[PDB]
């Protein structure tokens, strides 16, 4: 097992990395790097409880 929480630093992902992911998710690839990071992260965030 791995202590703490997941280790997915979307921020660490350059603009190119986020652009590729966002595109694969049909998500807009506009805005600054930070914007792209939040966009992709927002989609990943699955608060779905059950």
- Full domain range(s) for residue 21: 1-50
CA dist 37 and 50 (Å) reads 26
Phi, psi for residue 41 in degrees, rounded to 5: -60, -40
Instruction: Check if the beta carbon of residue 34 is closer than 8 Å to that of residue 15.
Output: no
Instruction: Check if the beta carbon of residue 21 is closer than 8 Å to that of residue 40.
Output: yes
Q: Residue 1, SS3?
A: coil
Q: How many structural domains compose the chain?
A: 1
């Amino acid at each position: 097992g791995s202590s703490g929480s997941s280790g997915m630093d979307v921020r660490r992902l350059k603009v190119n990395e986020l652009r590729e992911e966002l595109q694969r998710r049909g998500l807009d690839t506009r805005g600054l790097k930070a914007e792209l990071a939040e966009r992709l992260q927002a989609a990943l965030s699955g608060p779905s409880s059950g």
